[PDB]
């Protein structure tokens, strides 16, 4: 996918320029993406790596600039990890049309109630799992991520009154978003 990769990489570069306002060349990577020249994510990663190295050498391994660069390289690698987890999620998370988190993916994310100590059960999408814990992304404001122990999870088709919940404004908005998602899912309303 020539254009798809190009689109994703543009989000990353743009975001890392925004990250960089904390306080190989950047235009070169910026040039390369803009022209859609990258042939692999791995190749993009190796350029970001080169840039990091040149940067730390340029300014000193303990400069403010080298600290920034190390942070940016880690964030870029995180964005690339996430892009591999689910490309649709990544696209919608960056383009953010109205109700972006409600559009289904293929395959569909498993939906759960996930409990974090002190918050009660909150609705979430499962992004990945291992035997002892599950990486979820919550519905509702900020759409944050947590690793949740297996026994702090219930499937979404369990009735909510059977669960320990704390019914805040934020919790109610999360639940409204969940139900909109469940509807889009049954409708086959994919993002176009």
């Amino acid at each position: 996918n020539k254009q798809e990769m190009g689109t994703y990489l543009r989000f990353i570069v743009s975001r890392m320029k925004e990250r960089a306002i904390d306080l190989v060349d950047v235009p070169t990577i910026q040039e390369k993406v803009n022209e859609g020249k990258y042939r692999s994510y791995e190749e993009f990663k190796a350029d970001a790596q080169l840039l990091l190295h040149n940067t730390v050498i340029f300014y000193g391994a303990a400069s403010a600039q080298a600290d920034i660069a190390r942070m940016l390289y880690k964030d870029t690698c995180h964005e690339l990890d996430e892009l591999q987890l689910c490309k649709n999620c990544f696209y919608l998370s960056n383009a953010r049309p109205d109700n972006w988190f409600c559009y289904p993916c293929i395959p569909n994310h498993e939906l759960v109630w996930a409990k974090m100590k002190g918050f009660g059960f909150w609705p979430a999408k499962v992004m990945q799992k291992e035997d002892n814990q599950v990486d979820v992304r919550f519905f509702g404001h900020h759409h944050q991520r947590a690793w949740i122990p297996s026994e702090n999870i219930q499937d979404i088709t369990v009735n909510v009154h059977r669960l320990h919940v704390k019914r805040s404004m934020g919790w109610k908005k999360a639940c409204d978003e969940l139900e909109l998602h469940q509807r889009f899912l049954r409708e086959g309303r994919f993002w176009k």
Partner: peptide, 11 residues
């Protein structure tokens, strides 16, 4: 915050 969400802080 990462595009696909920052880590949710414990209570």
């Amino acid at each position: 915050a990462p595009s696909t969400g920052g880590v949710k802080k414990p209570h």
